């Protein structure tokens, strides 16, 4: 018998995909222990997701301390030279 959490079943679970996408979008680094609970790491097999911060939108967004030109929130991967 196979439960939803059983290791052979994880790839069929809509939540396993959705929360791995969520984790990729939400990380700043490959270092999982500093970012995710033991629960999240085990349940969503986060070792095997290519987590590194490269898919977090906030990696690419300007967040300047003094913003004269009203330019914070701009995302560099939307510039014409990209």
């Amino acid at each position: 018998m196979q439960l939803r959490r059983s290791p052979g079943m994880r790839p069929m679970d809509r939540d396993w995909h959705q929360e791995r996408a969520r984790a990729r979008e939400q990380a700043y680094s490959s270092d999982l222990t500093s970012q995710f609970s033991e629960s999240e790491i085990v349940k969503y097999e986060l070792d095997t997701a290519q987590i590194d911060g490269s898919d977090n939108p906030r990696t690419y967004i300007w967040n300047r301390t003094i913003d004269l030109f009203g330019m914070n929130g701009t995302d560099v991967r939307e510039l014409r030279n990209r």
Binding site: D15, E19, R22, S34, Q35, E40, Y44
Partner: protein, 140 residues
């Protein structure tokens, strides 16, 4: 000290040589101008062992992704040790009087929880978010 008090677990403290323990004891004794010289070694060792145990069981883990021991773990474990030694001595002295000579200290009604009841405890308490509950979780 060669191993530092933040680097050792309760099991490690039991595994240290007497000299490694005595270095850590000597460091804890720096936190009082009296050094608690009239309290014997076994009691100071018990206070430190208990502080290490209480750090690792009671002031450990995270509140949201933040560590519950926010300050320096060395000085936290030392202040927690000094709090224990001062309670083994009977508590804070609010007032002391001898051969006419008398002094009164500004200890006051500082609180009712354990750490609030000594100066070392009040110092230690600032390292651990003042025992506040900023923990948060979410469903997935």
């Amino acid at each position: 000290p060669d191993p530092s008090i933040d680097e050792v677990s309760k099991s490690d403290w039991d595994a240290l040589t007497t000299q490694e323990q005595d270095d850590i004891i000597s460091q804890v004794e720096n936190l009082s101008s009296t050094g608690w010289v009239n309290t014997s070694r076994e009691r100071k060792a018990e206070a430190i062992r208990s502080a290490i145990a209480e750090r690792d069981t009671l002031y450990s883990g995270n509140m949201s992704r933040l560590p519950t021991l926010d300050g320096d773990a060395e000085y936290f474990t030392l202040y927690l040790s000094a709090h224990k030694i001062q309670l083994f001595e009977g508590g804070e002295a609010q007032s002391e009087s001898g051969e006419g000579g008398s002094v009164s200290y500004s200890t006051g009604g500082g609180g009712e929880k354990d750490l609030q009841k000594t100066r070392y405890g009040r110092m230690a308490l600032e390292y651990v978010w003042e025992d506040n509950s900023i923990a948060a979780l979410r469903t997935y």
